[PDB]
Structures are given as C-alpha cells and as structure tokens.
Scaffold this active site. Structure first.
Site, PDB file in Angstrom:
ATOM      1  N   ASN A   1      -9.275   9.881   0.540  1.00 55.66           N
ATOM      2  CA  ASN A   1      -9.434   8.467  -0.511  1.00 55.66           C
ATOM      3  C   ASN A   1      -8.616   7.916  -0.875  1.00 55.66           C
ATOM      4  O   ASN A   1      -7.369   7.804   0.062  1.00 55.66           O
ATOM      5  CB  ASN A   1      -8.719   9.894  -1.323  1.00 55.66           C
ATOM      6  CG  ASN A   1      -9.704  10.971  -1.573  1.00 55.66           C
ATOM      7  OD1 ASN A   1      -9.208  11.968  -2.377  1.00 55.66           O
ATOM      8  ND2 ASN A   1     -10.944  11.738  -1.158  1.00 55.66           N
TER       9      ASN A   1
ATOM     10  N   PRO B   1       0.708  -0.832  -0.424  1.00 50.46           N
ATOM     11  CA  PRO B   1       0.270  -0.040  -0.062  1.00 50.46           C
ATOM     12  C   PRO B   1       0.743   1.587   0.076  1.00 50.46           C
ATOM     13  O   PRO B   1       2.345   1.584   0.541  1.00 50.46           O
ATOM     14  CB  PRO B   1      -1.081  -0.143   1.516  1.00 50.46           C
ATOM     15  CG  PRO B   1      -1.091  -1.716   1.423  1.00 50.46           C
ATOM     16  CD  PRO B   1       0.346  -2.373   0.577  1.00 50.46           C
TER      17      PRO B   1
ATOM     18  N   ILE C   1      -3.533  -3.170  -3.370  1.00 48.91           N
ATOM     19  CA  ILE C   1      -4.267  -3.735  -4.453  1.00 48.91           C
ATOM     20  C   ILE C   1      -5.615  -4.496  -3.536  1.00 48.91           C
ATOM     21  O   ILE C   1      -4.594  -5.531  -2.704  1.00 48.91           O
ATOM     22  CB  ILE C   1      -3.025  -4.501  -4.728  1.00 48.91           C
ATOM     23  CG1 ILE C   1      -2.386  -3.330  -5.455  1.00 48.91           C
ATOM     24  CG2 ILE C   1      -3.727  -5.667  -5.899  1.00 48.91           C
ATOM     25  CD1 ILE C   1      -0.944  -4.252  -6.348  1.00 48.91           C
TER      26      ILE C   1
ATOM     27  N   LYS D   1      -0.814  -6.388   4.853  1.00 49.66           N
ATOM     28  CA  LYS D   1      -0.025  -6.308   4.079  1.00 49.66           C
ATOM     29  C   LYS D   1       1.853  -6.365   4.808  1.00 49.66           C
ATOM     30  O   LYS D   1       1.533  -5.696   5.909  1.00 49.66           O
ATOM     31  CB  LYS D   1      -0.259  -5.281   3.012  1.00 49.66           C
ATOM     32  CG  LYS D   1      -1.288  -5.364   2.466  1.00 49.66           C
ATOM     33  CD  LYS D   1      -1.641  -5.934   0.709  1.00 49.66           C
ATOM     34  CE  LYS D   1      -2.788  -5.969   0.093  1.00 49.66           C
ATOM     35  NZ  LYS D   1      -2.720  -6.419  -1.735  1.00 49.66           N
TER      36      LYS D   1
END
Ligand SMILES: COc1ccc(N2Cc3ccc(O)cc3OC2=O)cc1
Ligand SMILES: COc1ccc(N2Cc3ccc(O)cc3OC2=O)cc1
Ligand SMILES: COc1ccc(N2Cc3ccc(O)cc3OC2=O)cc1
EC number: 5.3.2.1
Lengths: 114, 114, 114
Positions: free
Chosen positions: C97, C1, C64, C32
């Site tokens: 966001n 990320p 992802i 992750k």
C-alpha cells in the site's frame, strides 16, 4: 481487499479457522473473489479502549472500491458479528478504519493494479 | 481517536501507567471523550531509523477532525515528549502519521460514526 | 519515508542486514536521504493471502511526495524483488500500500514537516 485485526485477545483464543472464515465472508460482502483477499490477525497486543484493558480490537479494511457510507455500515455489522462470536469481543470495543484505495497505490506481483 | 506506537524498545521499559497516560493526555489534547480513545503500544519491534537500531518509534494518530497544521505540531510536541520521558526515545527518531478520518470511514458497534 | 513489512515467514528467515538493505535501496529509489528512512519488519505473523497460509507479505510505503503511477510500479518491482530473493516470498503473494503523505500530517522531532 486487505483486512487487519489487532487485538489484546491471546493467540490461543483466536480460532485456527478465523483467517479462512474472514476471507470467505469478506469475499461475499465485498463481491471480490477470495483469491484477492488478504487477512492478518495480531493477538496478544498491549491495548486499551476507553482506558480499559478488557478485550478490544482495532481493525482496518482496505479495498479498491466497494467502500462507502452504506457499504461500511454493513461491513461493521459483519465484522462486529465475527469478532463477537469468534473472539468474544464486545462490539462497542471494536474500531474499523475503512480505506478506499486507488489502484495506482496498490502494488502486487512486481507492479500495481493501475 | 486511536493512537498506535510501534517501537524497538523492550516491553519491560514500557511503564505501568503508560496506556492510561496516553489515553488521558490525548483526551485533553484532542478534546475528545476518553471513553472513545483507543491506544496501542507495540514493543520489541525489529526496526531501523536512518539505518540505526537505536531506540525509535513509528506512530499514528487517527481522529475524526481535530487534525491540521497547528494541532498536529502540538500533538507532536506532546507525544514526542511522552516517548522521550517514558520510553527514552529521542524526538528525532520518532515519526507520527496523522490521519483525519471521515466519519463514514470509521466503523464502531455495528455501524459507522457518520 | 517509512516502509513496513508484515509477513508470516519466520524471524530466522530474515537475513542479517535486511533492514540496512531496505534503507539503502529505498534511498536510491525515492531520492530521499537514508538518514530519514525508517524500516520495520514484522515476521512470524498470522496471515493468509487468497485463503492460503503459504509465505506472503503485506506492506506499506509512506512518503512525502515521490508517490505516483509510474513511481509506484517501480517501487513494486524493487520491493517484490527483494522480498522474493531475501525472504523467498512469491511476488504474487505480496501487497504494498502506497501513501502520499502531506508534510503537515507527519510528526517528527517535536513538530511536523512542511
Ligand atoms: C483483479 O481483481 C482485484 C480484486 C481486488 C483487489 N484488491 C486487493 C487489495 C490489495 C491491497 C489493498 O490495500 C486493497 C486491495 O483491495 C482490492 O480491491 C485487487 C484486484
Ligand atoms: C464521542 O464521540 C466520538 C468520539 C471520538 C470518536 N473517534 C473514535 C475514532 C476511531 C477510529 C479512528 O480512526 C478515529 C477515531 O476518531 C474519533 O474521533 C468518535 C466518536
Ligand atoms: C531530509 O528531509 C526529509 C526526508 C524524509 C522525510 N519523510 C519522512 C517520513 C516520515 C513518515 C511518513 O509517513 C512519510 C515520510 O516521508 C518523508 O518524505 C521528511 C523529511
């Protein structure tokens, strides 16, 4: 909404009122009350547009709805107008990326808008 | 297209020629005319990659088309090669976000590209 | 990320270790590995939120997968919490966001993920 401007125009050439002008004008254009609108201006950037380092701006406008073909055409006139007058940037040296955000993908106040 | 690089490497380590080189290399890679290519380099950033502050970069490439599986692999080889050669950043400390923009969502000169 | 925070709070107000903390907490939140988490903090920005220039932040989290309704509400609680406790920014002056990225649209190590 959230509006971001990155520009090679120096900080002293960004008027002190520009953030407030953008906030007010974006409220009118999007129909969203101004308390929801965030603005971010980043001057003094190392940038080139068509290989030239004359004044230019790379911008983004994010909104939950109020994004689309016709609306984006209108926003570009509003925003090019503002950048032209306040920052003296030629409108053919301005890009604006438009993003229609899903409410689930916008966080605020410990949660999201979904 | 527009290409942005954010990096912790110092401003003085960014070669004279770098923005022009990115402009030309991206023109060739994308097939897009150089007059429409914008490039933006942001050095001296406070960043970590894997918790380490060794040289790294976070980048984005936006294009109207010319984005996809194979093309993005090719862009990554190109652009990591450039960041390694010119900025001394290891390719495993670079991320590049690719965005296939709808023409209606790209504003320029008082309109959009749609 | 990758996690990006842009804020108007001054650089001196970012505590030592903040990027390490973000890396570690984001590893725990997303599942992750921390060695692949990138963090970028940009203080001293020219920003407004609701027309106010009081402390605020505009952030993005790209991953992802691991992005969605419930997960994003959890990330917002975590990240607003950290921004409030570490940077003294009110959660109601933070936007985040969230972007669920396709692996083929993320470049790394001369190639892309899949
Ligand atoms: C409650 O009314 C509203 C009005 C506007 C919004 N926001 C805030 C917002 C934040 C981040 C972003 O990327 C886009 C975005 O767009 C909106 O429409 C959210 C709620
Ligand atoms: C010559 O016609 C052209 C050539 C290139 C473009 N552009 C410019 C551009 C701007 C912003 C953005 O996010 C993506 C983007 O990609 C393009 O393909 C647009 C028209
Ligand atoms: C250990 O394997 C991994 C771990 C994490 C990732 N990454 C890295 C990454 C980079 C950029 C981006 O926009 C999103 C993103 O999200 C991931 O899941 C990719 C592979």
């Amino acid at each position: 909404p959230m509006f971001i401007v990155n520009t090679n125009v120096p900080r002293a050439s960004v008027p002190d009122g520009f953030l407030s002008e953008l906030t007010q004008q974006l409220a009118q254009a999007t129909g969203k009350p101004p308390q929801y609108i965030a603005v971010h201006v980043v001057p003094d950037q190392l940038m080139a547009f068509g290989g030239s380092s004359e004044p230019c701006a790379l911008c983004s406008l994010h909104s939950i709805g109020k994004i689309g073909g016709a609306q984006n055409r209108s926003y570009s006139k509003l925003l090019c107008g503002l950048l032209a007058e306040r920052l003296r940037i030629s409108p053919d040296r301005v890009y604006i990326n438009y993003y229609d955000m899903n409410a689930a993908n916008v966080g605020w106040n410990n949660s999201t808008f979904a």
